[PDB]
Design a protein around this nucleic acid. Structure first.
Ligand code: ZAN
Ligand code: ZAN
Ligand code: CA
Ligand code: CA
Ligand code: CA
Ligand code: CA
Ligand code: CA
Ligand code: CA
Ligand code: CA
Ligand code: MG
Lengths: 937, 920
DNA sequence: TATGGTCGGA
DNA sequence: GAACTATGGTCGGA
RNA sequence: UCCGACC
RNA sequence: CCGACC
């Protein structure tokens, strides 16, 4: 099997030395990383090579790393450190805390070295990380799982090494390497059980974009493992057994093994475990809800009911504010949505499953097969916008195409004019701008994560937070240009997103989980939408929808019928179901199926009730799709059929399960064409300006089949794609990229395409006009306050020569740091900033005056008086010459100086808030409008 | 009463010739200053300053008067000088307060006058039509007052009352160069005299003529106009002479109601209905009293004019003679302005021709609903109609116990962590009002004046309530205060309850016992949240509630036909009698119903039919005399009509001044119905009718005096006996045996013990080594340097002096804030190269220099054991700075020095506290 | 040259 | 009179 | 940016 | 404490 590649695959993984054998897995994982990052061989015998008993009882990785850095070889900057909370859990928490599992992850990139006896792939072990748990991690232990991002062996990229590219069997060798046998790492033997497309990933600069694949490995055996439950005291278990426990293969040999394999993802879905129902509490339905017109169509695909008590515990376990009307989760073999039974008057727990939910035949015996696992809940809704895919369909199903082009166009101009007229007004008053910046972006996540506002050097990392921080210390956005420049860039970027993606905001629109009406109250083509709270659009708001038409759609939208106009009817029967949209269970075909072959197992619909967009819309009847069986080759080989090659009984089953793995790995590594065929359709439809003619329809079918590839077992290669383009699509093979893909109009004449018209005839003009009005509406870097300490020390320096020397050294040192500030490198923008900052913080007084300036009793010397003087000098010397340097390095001190300077006797008191307490305060809107009222009179 | 009259000859300040040419505003402000400084306005070189006419700040006018007070806001003066007294719908108000003159000397004014500053109130129809400058309002002590304070001159001589009324009504009163005639008077309630409480009456005056007025339009350019004509403009007396003149008098308030003018509808756009909606059962009962429909476009304008966030579903306002509520027509498919009026709304026959009688005037809009509670009037009625009285008691009591425990448990858990306690303190009280008013957190000395803010200020700088005793003691004091408030007042709060505007079903969708409630946003109870009410029984009631039928149980049905109507409750127009009438005789002109959907409170309720009310005609006599009858005395024609109108004013002023018995008769019913423990027996129903009629006194012309009250008690009640206060009116159970009345039981058997139990129920210390950082820092320097040591010693001694002063003024005892400030001034007095570093002159605020920190540090070090409250009240500010500095760790974030204003505008983020508390 | 969309960053 | 004796509720300002 | 689920 | 409202 291509022996050239096989040799370079002998030792890709780092070796585990005997000295590290008696180590906690976390310690083993972390220690190995530093060695790799420091170039030191783990088996190097020059070093002492003795285990430090002190490592077995640690809480910060820095302590473990420091003991090694004492050795000369390690003594380079430290690599990213596992957060202490994660580290403690790995050693003392059994890898699980609050439903979160520590994850062992790696990124593998091809070795630049082309030496024949050299590792084919260079390995980077990622720091221990906390991630949501899943069924398999909860059942067999989060430490028994290892995931990697490996470059796809079938990548047609120039950057691919030649050993693999030239060798014909190269693909088979790597695939065999992954699946044939165990892989050794940190004292554990890992076996592959699953693989999925990770998409195009940028090769790590530590070692041109290449498609990478995520492979999942289970720890079958380890040195600490025992033959036939804590982490370091687990029992051997073969992947063939784990998959059997998950899928119950005995009762599922009739499934196509490729599809069987794809259901392993259901054991890996990130979920919160809620509760374990008893067998007598579970209602397994034998038949799905069926069309009342005898078409046989299923009307409740993927959705079933759940008791009110089950919903209540969902709220209690997840700490929700209210009881969720519906949740997305997994239950044994069931995957889909569950909705509260509006008819439940009791307090008994019960949940039902339906055929369309149950993806394999399951017995629901083990506790873990009867635990309701929640992946998400129906929450408060946001306003949504449009996307490039709805636009042609909206234009194609319009009674008047011209009226639509104007309607959507007007939405764009008036949304932009609001966005700017609001920011321009706020910029006049600092309190109003602070409110706007918090309303623009929310950093609550990073604030909770760090327990403080994250700060890069001397200013907050986020530009939004930087603005608020400096304004909170007294800076006026229209008086200091540093703040203006930040608001300018932020506005330009938000406009650039509108230019590059045309996300035209529609206030009367949202994405809502789709649910079917179990109770037959909604007639065909009626939907029910009730909100949990007031849904606001400009000067109109809603708690429900009634007596009006709505537009529903799903992405991707390709067929003319992928958008559908229906009638919003509020049924008081359903009133308690909030933040979900309920399709009727009457009619020939479920409405969800009409939305791009959608269902009710987690699907979210685009819901739009904007009249100017809805009433021009006319429905299209679902299209008659072409037979593409000649090109789309389906592999329906069953598990049973695979087993016949080997026999019957345990060993035969066990062999067949490993066949399923490697066979599915091969099918999972086939080059994907969903991207190409989708982009081809965009170009062809654009050139013909048609999303409804014959070629447009077939391509919509092709992309509709390709997206379901891994679950339908569809083989599709370059050859078939070129064949389909010749036989059915008119022989054109390479089509021109559309004009909207470019940032400026490179077309001839007035734009003809709706996207081109909106991007170049409506958006870019309006963007440029509003930006100039915003510039015209708006300042000086200089601020006499920020130089108070300079003037104060110069005066002392003039009177005293002793102080003069310190001033000169400080000034000269600052210039050196500015020189360093003055380019892309392996070390990124943050690391470069920190290095310049470290020299900046290095400037130090280096005696009564020195003590008064250094204030060494303060632990954080960035809070002493010397820091205030150093920043003041820097501002005076480089406010104009280099503004970014004086601020990114001295902003926090300059803010302190401003708040000191702006304080007036008697008029209140400034407040030095702790980082943490500051990071937990939000602007009070009600305070803002009342204060502005007091100013108007 | 000759003695009273001689004292009534010269009540008002005199208008000298030198101020004749002065603008009204200037004259009023000058008069106020001279009175405040006690200077006669009628031989010094007091001469007109032409600078005053062009003035834009009253202080500039006042500055010119330096030859030897509260100030109108500058925007008001400008609107008064150059804005025609009207700005943005606000009208500048000429207000005065009168009080009995202390001196009893005869030939001296009976009343002492104080002109209040010029001020903004919302305008009304009358000010918008004839001009705010022509309106003057006074709070005067009632002549029919039995108070001991009433001066003997009035009390001892009867007939003084008639004289005081004659002074007010007979003719004009000269003030600031204008002739003022009384036109209206209403009860202002008991009001404390400015330097013992007495009942005062609001009297309204209109300027008929003046020095600047023209015989038959800027402020100084008015035209003569008699009150008899203004009222005739408002009420169209020619077409309303059929009305009882007292009721007609009562309608003058409609012209004085503070309202926001929205739009002026044209005559074609007005739909006057000749008949009200009536019962489908033939009773003849009105089912839409006070309520009509309006177009969606008129509603959208109300949002635009009032700056509302959404279109209101219903408004309370006045349109010509129409008073009441208007609701959006859910069936309005058009875009044309239209409004409708019904007989019940129209309190007089108006022609709807003048624009001011065709303007829609809004007082209030249906708005976001707030959770309510059970007032003490509802509890007896709930028990009277309870299927099982013992289960009602059990529920309301068990609910109360659960609520108290939840609150106490929340406070205790919060203290454990500073971020959580900050959230509880903010939830406890809101300082937004003080913050917006001062643009900062108000500070007394070195710490915020409010204890609640002081805790947040010091926790925001790193202090821990569990680790610093100063924070601990403040929190304990605050908790005790809340517990003491809870013991005094029994406030049972029910989350699933709210007061909501009552509307009627024009569209005939609701049945007799069905109501519809949709909310504008999520109504949150701790357990659940609602956007609407469906498939549950609710209780509806109105305050006052006295009769057993005054609370009713209905079925909440959500009708998609009414879905657009939000923040309102809609009653049925079907049935014999309207539901609103059952709630203390309620209507839909702005009545708000108490709505409860709490199943525990609702489930036991059994509805009672409306009672047959006794005939109290013997004690309650109504004056139904009509305007015509009044006119028949004077004849026919304009002149007769003119003095009939002035007669109505004088007769009504007397009626309006009749001592009111609503308070006492209500208090008596409470005391008697408590002794009887019955709100449904003979006397309770008697007293409910009595108070049910007394509230409608002014509109029904009911005469009721001590004599009638004495004989009503004598015959129908237990007369002449002074009824005691119920036990629950006291803070403790001074009664015999275990309490039995529902209120005594809930306050004394349920609330008191639970509150007391929490009150009965390594650690906190004054010391904090971080706070002595600067002191220890300067002792090291002082040990190796003399000059500094002398500075340190002098400073250390100087704080000693201030500490002694704090004992002299703040330890025990002109007012307390002044004393604290006096020490603070002495404290900030303590002040000094090295001196230049310690005292940063470039800082205007010396409290921000390094010296302020050292002085705070040594003061803490030297007196944290002995004088804690001194150290903090003077230096808490700097101690918080020091704490924030010391707690900062290299790389663990950056502290933020916030300004006072930007600090005062920030708020605890509930989402942060909850998320951070999770993950420890 | 190889898709769109919804969420989160335990 | 020494002593009798002044309502509930909804919302806003200061 | 990047990382991670989901349809 | 001041102001409308039922
Ligand atoms: N990567 C993707 N890009 C675009 N669309 C996607 C993608 N993944 C899923 N979808 C959409 O989600 C649909 C898949 O539906 P499901 O996720 O429900 N899978 P389904 O075929 O129904 O099989 P089951 O698991 O339910 O037995 C596709 O047809 C697409 O519409
Ligand atoms: N000061 C008050 N104290 C107690 N209850 C009051 C008070 N003012 C009004 N009310 C209540 O509101 C009712 C008055 O209703 P209205 O204000 O509707 N007057 P009404 O007699 O109907 O005459 P119209 O002007 O509507 O023709 C009283 O019966 C009480 O229930
Ligand atoms: Ca599908
Ligand atoms: Ca689906
Ligand atoms: Ca599905
Ligand atoms: Ca009323
Ligand atoms: Ca009424
Ligand atoms: Ca994607
Ligand atoms: Ca009152
Ligand atoms: Mg009534």
């Amino acid at each position: 099997h291509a022996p050239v590649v096989a040799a370079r695959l002998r030792n890709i993984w780092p070796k585990f030395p005997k000295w590290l054998h008696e180590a906690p897995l976390a310690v083993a994982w972390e220690v190995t990383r530093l060695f790799m990052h420091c170039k030191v061989d783990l088996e190097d015998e020059s070093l002492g090579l003795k285990y430090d008993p002190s490592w077995s009882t640690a809480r910060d990785v820095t302590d473990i790393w420091k003991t090694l850095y004492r050795l000369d070889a390690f003594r380079k900057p430290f690599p990213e450190k596992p957060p202490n909370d994660v580290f403690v859990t790995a050693m003392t928490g059994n890898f699980e805390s609050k439903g979160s599992a520590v994850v062992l992850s790696a990124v593998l990139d091809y070795n630049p070295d082309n030496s024949p006896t050299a590792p084919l792939y260079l390995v980077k072990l990622k720091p221990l990380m906390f991630e949501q748990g899943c069924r398999l991690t909860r059942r067999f232990g989060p430490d028994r799982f290892f995931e990697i991002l490996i470059p796809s062996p079938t990548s047609t990229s120039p950057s691919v090494p030649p050993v693999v590219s030239k060798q014909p069997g190269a693909v088979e060798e790597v695939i065999q390497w992954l699946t044939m046998g165990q892989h050794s790492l940190v004292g554990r033997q890992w076996r592959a059980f699953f693989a999925k497309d990770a998409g195009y990933r940028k090769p790590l600069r530590e070692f041109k974009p290449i498609i990478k694949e995520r492979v999942h490995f289970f720890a079958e055996t380890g040195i600490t493992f025992r033959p036939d439950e804590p982490v370091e005291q687990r029992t051997e278990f073969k992947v063939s057994q784990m998959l059997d426990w998950l899928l119950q293969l005995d009762n599922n040999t009739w499934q196509p093994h490729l599809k069987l394999f794809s259901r392993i993802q259901l054991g890996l879905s990130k979920t919160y475990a809620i509760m374990t129902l008893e067998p007598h509490q579970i209602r397994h339905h034998k038949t799905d809800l069926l069309s009342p017109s005898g078409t046989g169509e299923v009307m409740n695909d993927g959705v079933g009911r759940m008791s009110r008590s089950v919903a209540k515990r969902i709220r209690d376990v997840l700490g929700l504010g209210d009881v969720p009307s519906a949740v997305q989760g997994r239950f044994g073999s069931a995957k889909g949505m569950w909705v509260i039974d509006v008819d439940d008057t009791g307090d008994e727990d019960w949940i039902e499953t339906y055929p369309s939910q149950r993806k394999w035949e399951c017995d629901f015996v083990d506790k873990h097969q009867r635990t309701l696992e929640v992946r998400s809940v129906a929450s408060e809704l946001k306003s949504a916008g449009l996307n490039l895919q709805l636009l042609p369909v909206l234009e194609d199903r319009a009674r008047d195409k011209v009226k639509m082009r104007q309607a959507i166009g007007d939405r764009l101009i008036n949304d932009l004019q609001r966005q700017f007229s609001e920011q321009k007004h706020a910029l006049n008053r600092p309190v109003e701008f602070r409110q706007w910046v918090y309303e623009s972006y929310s950093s609550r996540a990073t604030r909770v994560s760090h327990g403080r506002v994250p700060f890069l050097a001397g200013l907050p990392d986020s530009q939004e937070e930087t603005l608020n921080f400096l304004m909170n210390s007294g800076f006026d956005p229209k008086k200091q240009k540093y703040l203006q420049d930040i608001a300018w860039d932020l506005q330009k970027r938000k406009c650039d997103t509108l230019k590059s993606k045309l996300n035209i905001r529609v206030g009367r629109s949202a994405y809502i989980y789709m649910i079917a009406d179990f109770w037959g109250v909604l007639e065909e083509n009626e939907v029910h939408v009730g909100f949990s709270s007031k849904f606001r659009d400009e000067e109109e708001s809603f708690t429900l929808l009634s007596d009006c038409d709505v537009l529903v759609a799903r992405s991707p939208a390709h067929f003319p019928s992928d958008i559908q106009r229906v009638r919003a009817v509020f049924k008081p029967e359903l009133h308690s179901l909030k933040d979900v949209i309920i399709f009727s269970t009457k009619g020939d075909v479920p409405l969800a199926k009409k939305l791009s072959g959608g269902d009710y197992d987690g699907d979210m619909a685009w819901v739009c009730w904007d009249p100017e967009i809805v009433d021009g819309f006319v429905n299209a009847e679902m299209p008659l799709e072409p037979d593409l069986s000649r090109y789309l080759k389906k592999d329906k080989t069953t598990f049973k059929q695979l087993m016949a090659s080997h026999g019957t009984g345990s060993a035969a089953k066990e062999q067949t399960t490993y066949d399923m793995i490697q066979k599915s790995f091969h099918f999972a590594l086939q080059p994907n064409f969903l991207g190409m065929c989708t982009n081809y359709k965009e170009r062809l439809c654009y050139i013909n300006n048609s999303v409804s003619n014959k070629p447009a329809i077939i391509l919509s079918s092709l992309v509709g089949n390709l997206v379901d590839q891994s679950k339908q077992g569809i083989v599709f290669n370059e050859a078939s794609w070129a064949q389909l383009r010749r036989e059915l699509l008119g022989g054109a093979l390479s089509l021109p990229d559309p004009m909207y893909k470019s940032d400026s109009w490179l077309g001839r004449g007035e734009p003809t395409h709706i996207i081109d018209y909106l991007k170049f005839s409506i958006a870019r003009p309006a963007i440029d006009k509003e930006l100039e009005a915003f510039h015209n509406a708006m300042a000086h870097f200089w601020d006499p306050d920020l130089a108070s300490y300079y003037t104060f020390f110069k005066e002392i320096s003039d009177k005293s020569r002793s102080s003069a020397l310190l001033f000169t050294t400080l000034k000269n040192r600052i210039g050196e740091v500015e020189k360093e500030y003055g380019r892309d490198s392996k070390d990124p923008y943050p690391v470069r900033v920190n290095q310049v900052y470290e020299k900046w913080c290095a400037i130090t007084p280096e005696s009564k005056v020195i003590r008064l300036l250094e204030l060494s009793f303060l632990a954080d010397r960035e809070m002493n008086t010397w820091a205030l003087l150093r920043a003041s000098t820097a501002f005076k010397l480089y406010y104009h010459k280099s503004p970014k340097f004086v601020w990114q390095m001295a902003g926090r001190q300059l803010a302190y100086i401003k708040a000191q300077m702006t304080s007036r006797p008697g008029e209140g008191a400034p407040a030095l808030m702790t980082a943490f307490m500051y990071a937990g305060l939000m602007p009070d809107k009600k305070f803002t409008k009342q204060y502005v009222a007091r100013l108007e009179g």
